Design an enzyme around this catalytic site. Structure first.
Site, PDB file in Angstrom:
ATOM      1  N   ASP A  85     -14.037   3.347   8.679  1.00 39.74           N
ATOM      2  CA  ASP A  85     -14.459   3.121   7.297  1.00 39.74           C
ATOM      3  C   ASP A  85     -14.973   1.698   7.201  1.00 39.74           C
ATOM      4  O   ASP A  85     -14.574   0.940   6.319  1.00 39.74           O
ATOM      5  CB  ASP A  85     -13.235   3.314   6.382  1.00 39.74           C
ATOM      6  CG  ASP A  85     -13.556   3.197   4.902  1.00 39.74           C
ATOM      7  OD1 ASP A  85     -14.579   3.752   4.450  1.00 39.74           O
ATOM      8  OD2 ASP A  85     -12.758   2.563   4.182  1.00 39.74           O
ATOM      9  N   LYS A 100       0.846  -1.181   0.000  1.00 39.01           N
ATOM     10  CA  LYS A 100       0.000   0.000   0.000  1.00 39.01           C
ATOM     11  C   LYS A 100       0.887   1.239   0.000  1.00 39.01           C
ATOM     12  O   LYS A 100       1.871   1.295   0.732  1.00 39.01           O
ATOM     13  CB  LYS A 100      -0.906  -0.035   1.221  1.00 39.01           C
ATOM     14  CG  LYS A 100      -2.134   0.827   1.096  1.00 39.01           C
ATOM     15  CD  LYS A 100      -3.093   0.611   2.262  1.00 39.01           C
ATOM     16  CE  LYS A 100      -4.376   1.386   2.050  1.00 39.01           C
ATOM     17  NZ  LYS A 100      -5.348   1.122   3.113  1.00 39.01           N
TER      18      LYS A 100
END
Lengths: 260, 260
Positions: B186, B40
């Site tokens: 989230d 990432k």
């Protein structure tokens, strides 16, 4: 970005960043409480190449009534951007069913079914040809405008070349013989959709078109080796298909997909 | 892009563009024939904000031994880029199991389990707080440098404001009361991992930290409405959880997630 008209529409849905098999193109998953939609976008830099979604739109419409594909709902050119709005694929994503033990057999058969399904498509008046010379021109173009991948360079491990140019020149010289069939162009275990053990959906169709048979065959083999370490299923896949592995061509195609 | 050392490593794996719940950060799925890895990347523009992966790395390490999360393997700052290399999540992605008829009940229970699991985390020496004032500052920053979404503007449909600034000013005035608990930040049905009906994995943890309870509760409700049109399961979820819907706060959080 997008035309007002389309802007007005996609906003009824939740709209969420790419969560499926996608690459350069911007991709939005529209989440309705009733059904889903997929907005795909590529600009102009990639115009003409197998990345441009307008190409995918063209192949998507052509393949109607042949292979199970999603439906086209909206396509426009806006401010130098190709935008495609299509419905959702039919069924269940093949990618989810190999993390266990007892199950490899069925997968191979789907790959088998997928392959003969293409060899049955009348590629006569096909919209596009993805012959090697076609792709080799296309790749040359990308490298010429740094439109490639400096990030992960898979070749560095697999081959002895440092920069793409070389692997490029090497592939241009080793360029084999072609026998044109319907090729998916980017056949991954995340583009195929299953429904009751039978293939029911296909997506990521920008590189669809006429291309040497072995091409798709190389991708299938690749999945097999990754999602199932047993090299015995590679025989089975080749047994069900009834053809003898042209090992040299398979490798050739595995290397090409690394530059992209 | 990446340090030589890491460059050298990730190349043993196949490396493929983002195919899971991810947003601004560049994301690569490394495909080994034995196991998988996830690279990432976020640069510097997003430094400090809930987008910066260094934040996710921090929360990922802290949450060790509390919630089932993947493991940290490599993290570096390179040429103004935060890069995280973590293993794979544990189990099966919750997102695949609602496209049918008989099954909604079990989902709600997972959402239920997920929620009380956070309310059980000692948020005392927690690394970060995602209080409203914190986020409102953060959002202001993004809008100030066009680091938002001009593409899909969900508010345009839900509210009567034209540009973000307004929905921003509106939210800053309607800013409710907080009661700090562990918030995932989230929580989507694609970040949760199931294993034998029991929650076994969590990912996309950049917005993890201390934040009003209702926050996560608002996200759960949202999934329910989308993946299952029946508004009766919203009662069940609130029944299992045993709390009375603070409808005003729920809506407040649903609107905030639209600007991001």
């Amino acid at each position: 970005r997008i035309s007002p008209e389309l802007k007005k529409l996609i906003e009824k849905y939740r709209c969420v960043k790419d969560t499926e098999g996608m690459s350069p193109a911007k991709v939005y998953k529209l989440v309705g409480e009733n059904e889903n939609l997929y907005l795909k976008m590529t600009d102009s830099r990639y115009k003409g190449t197998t990345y441009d979604v307008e190409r995918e739109k063209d192949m998507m419409l052509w393949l109607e009534g042949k292979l199970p594909v999603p439906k086209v709902l909206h396509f426009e050119r806006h401010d130098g951007w190709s935008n495609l709005l299509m419905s959702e694929a039919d069924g269940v994503l093949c990618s989810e069913e190999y993390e266990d033990e007892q199950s490899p057999e069925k997968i191979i058969e789907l790959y088998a079914e997928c392959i003969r399904l293409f060899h049955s498509i009348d590629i006569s008046d096909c919209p596009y040809t993805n012959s090697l010379d076609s792709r080799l021109a296309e790749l040359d173009y990308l490298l010429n405008n740094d439109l490639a991948d400096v990030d992960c360079e898979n070749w560095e491990e697999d081959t002895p070349f440092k920069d793409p140019r070389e692997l490029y020149d090497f592939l241009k010289t080793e360029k084999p013989e072609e026998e044109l069939v319907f090729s998916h162009g980017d056949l991954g275990d995340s583009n195929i959709f299953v429904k009751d053990g039978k293939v029911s959906g296909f997506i990521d169709l920008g590189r669809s078109g006429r291309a040497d048979k072995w091409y798709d065959i190389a991708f299938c083999v690749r999945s097999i080796r990754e999602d199932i370490g047993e090299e015995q299923y590679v025989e089975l896949f080749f047994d069900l298909l009834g053809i003898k592995p042209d090992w040299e061509k398979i490798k050739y195609y595995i290397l090409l997909d690394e530059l992209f």
